Amino acid sequence: DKLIGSCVWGAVNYTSDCNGECLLRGYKGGHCGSFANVNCWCET
Structure with missing residues (x-):
């Protein structure tokens, strides 16, 4: 995975x-933690 930052x-x-x-x-459509709504990650 390729973190990006927070999602709070x-x-x-x-x-x-x-x-x-x-x-x-240049990462793929990322998203926010699934079971940790606080940090975002990329879909790499």
Whole structure:
């Protein structure tokens, strides 16, 4: 997996646009943790 940042509306390294932060890295459509809604990861 290829982390990107956090996925909490009120935290540091805030993402806001997972797919965005992932696209920024040329990664594939990322998403937010499935069983840990807090950090986002890419679908690599």
